[PDB]
């Protein structure tokens, strides 16, 4: 619920940590134009945990929502905001013709039409230098061989659906097994020992027996995997003791 | 809770009628066949059925 987001070339990233992620507050909003998660299901975020989750905010001309996706190309994808091929998150985009658009023309958004090289994923280029397209050294002024690379939008409500300003929110979270802080509204039970019971520490479901071994985990280490990448040892999120996950009889 | 269906509301709050047609495709005596015509029943010959 922000009145104005940032520009595409100057997209702002919001760091989230020590949170209780209840994504039910987002579903009651207006029907989004594109709610697609590339690594998970949108109804399963409330039952999982995330190590580092970042929220990006930027507004495009609407029809360019297809460019905010892994493996896409275009003016926004190659110059302003690029997504990696291994992206794991959700993309949220909705219409904002009533907020970020004016009948006389809203000129508070740029998209860096021209750039010398293609931008790498998760980078920000807010340089306002004159794009030297010709051979003569541009002296910082507009000329026949160098123009302003930062072009303004013509957002007006008179344009049909597709040219209106669309606010895009990219939630980039890390689901790798690691010490995390955001672990939803999942509540806790007690700690039984030496019995075949289920375990759900940070979304890792399964069945095993806790033995409280003597493995020495480092502060940045919480999960341990065997040869077959099966998690056989975990660090309790609450208590600093180490517990092994051995299969039952 | 009751709905506040009013024509002044835009898309997202207008009443939308939903019809769910649940079928059963398992082989069983059916009586809801489509509008297809029936033919003659030939026998003892390689034909489509």
């Amino acid at each position, epitope marked *: 619920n922000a009145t104005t987001f940032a520009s595409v070339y100057a997209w702002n990233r919001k760091r989230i940590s020590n949170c209780v992620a209840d994504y039910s507050v987002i579903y009651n909003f207006a029907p989004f134009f594109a709610f697609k998660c590339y690594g998970v299901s949108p109804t399963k975020l409330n039952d999982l945990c995330f190590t580092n989750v970042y929220a990006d905010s930027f507004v495009i001309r609407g029809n360019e929502v297809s460019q905010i996706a892994p493996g896409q190309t275009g003016n926004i994808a190659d110059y302003n905001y690029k997504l990696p091929d291994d992206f794991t998150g959700c993309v949220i985009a909705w219409n904002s013709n*009533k907020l970020d658009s*004016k009948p*006389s023309g809203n000129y508070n958004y740029l998209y860096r039409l021209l750039r010398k090289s293609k931008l790498k994923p998760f980078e920000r280029d807010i340089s306002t230098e004159i794009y030297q397209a010709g051979n003569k050294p541009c002296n910082g002024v507009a000329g026949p061989n160098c123009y302003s690379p930062l072009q303004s939008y013509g957002f007006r409500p008179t344009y049909g659906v597709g040219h209106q300003p669309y606010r895009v929110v990219v939630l980039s979270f890390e689901l790798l097994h690691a010490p995390a802080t955001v672990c939803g509204p999942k509540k806790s039970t007690n700690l039984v020992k030496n019995k075949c019971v289920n375990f759900n520490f940070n979304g890792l479901t399964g069945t095993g027996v806790l033995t409280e071994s003597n493995k020495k985990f480092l502060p940045f280490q919480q999960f341990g995997r065997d040869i077959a990448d099966t998690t056989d040892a975990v660090r309790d999120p609450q208590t600093l003791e180490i517990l092994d996950i051995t299969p039952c009889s | 809770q009751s709905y506040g269906f009013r024509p002044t509301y*835009g*898309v997202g709050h207008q009443p939308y009628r939903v019809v769910v047609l649940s079928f059963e495709l398992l082989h069983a005596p059916a009586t809801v066949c489509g509008p297809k015509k029936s033919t003659n029943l030939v026998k003892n010959k390689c034909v489509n059925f």
Partner: antibody
Amino acid sequence: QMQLVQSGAEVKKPGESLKISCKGSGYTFSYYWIGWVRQMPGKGLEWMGIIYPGDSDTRYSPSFQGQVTISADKSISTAYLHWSSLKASDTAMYYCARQGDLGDWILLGYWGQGTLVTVSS
Amino acid sequence: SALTQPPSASGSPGQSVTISCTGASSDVGGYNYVSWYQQHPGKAPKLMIYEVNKRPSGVPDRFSGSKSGNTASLTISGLQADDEADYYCCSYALSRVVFGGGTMLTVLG
């Protein structure tokens, strides 16, 4: 020329409905957010909610969600403010504001004249 | 959140005064979501200063604005007789406008 004209002063009693209006002219009444601001005698300004003339997208204040309703007529370019079951504390000066050609969508650069409610029982 | 403004201010003609405004919220868009309004007794308010690094048309350069952290400042270079009015600051960051207490303006004692 752009200008906002409101209804005259209305004096009623508690337990009676009230629906004041504020018509805007000189501009396209389809893209500018129209809202209402309450100002009690001797107090500051209090925002209640805004509406969109194009389609009904009402964002009410958390202290004025179900206490008051706001509507508009795009055919005649007139915004309304309907009340139900008025109380003794509702007597105040109410303005209608709209966004300008520059600023945010809730900047409210333009204003009207003022319709004061005067009650108590 | 709710904004806080001094109850009243005083200033002799010719000098400058400053109005404080503490409590403005913020979002992922920026920190310049502070606007000022002037309302004379008996009429509707008027937008004096919005986007403090800028100002609307038809407003003299006497009205200036600034912001340092969570505190906003309204600087008026020249004080005149027609400046006695209530000045309110507004925070419009989280899609919600909040008007402060206000400070009635008048001159020295």
